[PDB]
Write a protein that binds this ligand. Sequence first.
Ligand SMILES: [Zn+2]
Lengths: 183, 287, 298, 32, 76
Amino acid sequence: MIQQTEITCPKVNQFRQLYSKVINDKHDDVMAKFGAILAQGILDAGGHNVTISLQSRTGHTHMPSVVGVLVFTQFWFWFPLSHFLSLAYTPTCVIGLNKDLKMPKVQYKSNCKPSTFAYPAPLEVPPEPNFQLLDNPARVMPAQLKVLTMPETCRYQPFKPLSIGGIIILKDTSEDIEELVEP
Amino acid sequence: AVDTAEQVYISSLALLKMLKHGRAGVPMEVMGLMLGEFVDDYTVRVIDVFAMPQSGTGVSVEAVDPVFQAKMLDMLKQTGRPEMVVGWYHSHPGFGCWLSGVDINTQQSFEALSERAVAVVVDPIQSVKGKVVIDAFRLINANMMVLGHEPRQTTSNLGHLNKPSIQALIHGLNRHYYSITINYRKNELEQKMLLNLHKKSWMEGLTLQDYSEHCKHNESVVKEMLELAKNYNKAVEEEDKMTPEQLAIKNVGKQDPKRHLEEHVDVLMTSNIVQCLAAMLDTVVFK
Amino acid sequence: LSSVIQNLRTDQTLKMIKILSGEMAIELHLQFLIRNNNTDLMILKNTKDAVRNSVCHTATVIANSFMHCGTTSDQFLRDNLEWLARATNWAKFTATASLGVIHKGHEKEALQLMATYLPKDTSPGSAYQEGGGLYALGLIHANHGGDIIDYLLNQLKNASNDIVRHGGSLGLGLAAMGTARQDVYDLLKTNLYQDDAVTGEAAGLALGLVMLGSKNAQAIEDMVGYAQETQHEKILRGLAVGIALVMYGRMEEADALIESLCRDKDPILRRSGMYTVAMAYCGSGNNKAIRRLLHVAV
Amino acid sequence: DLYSRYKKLQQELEFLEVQEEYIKDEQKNLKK
Amino acid sequence: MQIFVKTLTGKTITLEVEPSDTIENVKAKIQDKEGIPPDQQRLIFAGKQLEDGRTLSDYNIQRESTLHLVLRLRGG
Ligand SMILES: [Zn+2]
């Protein structure tokens, strides 16, 4: 379960309370709760912005993501080896950079056959749309890469067909481009 | 400083000295010194173990003149190889394994004189069926009782190598001492030849079972499965024709299923198919 | 990529160099993570207060580093520094290691940030501070050569303690991961032949890192020629991964080596042959391999 | 869709001939 | 004079005693330098047991003499 919502599988909320049960119990082991506190950081890794995958964009396989996970399997013998899992963290961006600095804010939408999901809200408890416009540095779930749609009402259409999350360019055909901003 | 990844490396001929010296004096608590080597900070080996003479009773054990120890270690330098001592042992035949009153006093003397001095407890009258309850323990200082005692989790292999039972955690665990993990240093030209001499044979395969008692044994096997077949006839067919519950007292406390009637057939084949074929070779081989 | 950028130079020329080495691809990736952020503070507060005086500070500083990887935001090193300074002797090692995981990728900014913590001036009697420090610099500058390999190579020429020889070496092997530089290969050979029983896990991992997917004729023979006469077990577990990590996807060119380690009766070396046949077979439906793997599994 | 299915029927056949093998092999060692 | 108390643990303990001293003084010095009571110390000189009722000059113990420290061995 990584960057998944309730509509993907209902067992997510069953496990988050399963994690909180075994970490807020006193009559457990350190070894039992060590897997729970590690599962807190994996499930919310990178602020729901990265993901782990042994598979690349174009059918190829990643060398460091395999290296990053097999040395992570050696966490029995040396606890600082678990830092090496961060080599397998891969982004979920669709940033449409066309020139080496030109980052326009193109508002592209999606089309979901169900209602909204995809970036839930943090909880603190001590006529719906389906065409949600997103900017270019915006996250996207890897399971909704085919249900997005480029803005046909805008002239600005990309060169490569945006069907899978990664990096593309924008074929600019108009004049007087604007909207550059960098923090 | 202290780790939770220590493994004592006892040799095979060390442990055979331990059980033989422990079975020699059973009601009088034998007592000896453990000789090994500290190869690094937190792995310690022990290969050869000698013994000391005792004069103790069945609940405590004293020592002898200390002119015996230093004269022993002086003579072990010129023959074989020299080492410095790494601990000691005893036998606790009555109860299990925990460190008694004078056992913690001699532990404080050795960890101050020597470096760390792991102590080993042996029950000689427990290692009977197939398993041994030998364990090694190690004193912790009383000053560090507001912080970790065997702290600093480096690995995660320290949890399934030892699980202290209820009889262990009542005496000193874990506020007085702690336990330590034991593996066995097994290698070649010692282990393979250990089985190349114990469970071996030459003529045992090609030897008859001396039919004066072989076919006499098969009489008392056919007759008892005869009676189990008398028992089997009524049992299943009456149970199925009266009530089809696939359940109670014929399920909860029974013993006559189809597990009992073929294992007598299983014994009767292996005892005879081998015995038939063993008498076939010597007809060809021995003219 | 290092080959094709060499065959290219055999402006629009300078534009196509930078996109084939990768500088902006980290920057837009860094910009994507510094803009977007969804990390809940309350859960980490609900896990912090449920910790007694046990060893779980290492379990928490590995928890936040996973969820703040690339976020480049320090707030647990800012609100309760006294809570971080409670546990010791590897918790200080893991915490300064966790600081590099949070700053996952700067290539200049985290260097000058950790240029504050020099490896001779933080503390003379705390090697775990600089040990996890140099371990963290290798985590940040992963797969990006240049001065940083040579800058870490000169530090291991003048290392003080053997704890510092860990995080220097794991950082140096990670920064040269897949380069097969002869200079770092000579330093890690003679590091392995130091006959030290604590940097053997450090030398065994990083030697497979710099020789990743190389199939050397002599590295495999030297490492299995070293892991027979030794008498420690951490030296055997470090070289267990390193003889597996040297080969990656050869698909028939380790079948003598896979058979050579499984025929031996060293339990670590049998275990290491199972990792090597895993790494030589990636994404393949080799029916003979899974025949052989499950026969020795049972 | 007459050739893409035909290789998939082989891979389901070849995996299943492996999956019948080691479970049949495991039953020998599980008796031990 | 300076003596070399060669213990059985591979550690030589150097002491500053006088030829007119006894064994109880050496035991007290060892206890002050470490933490072993006098009743749990057995000094052996060339395979001979030293008694607390005599001095160092009775056993011909001169400057720089090899000793042997044996602790009280007792289990229960
Ligand atoms: Zn005892």
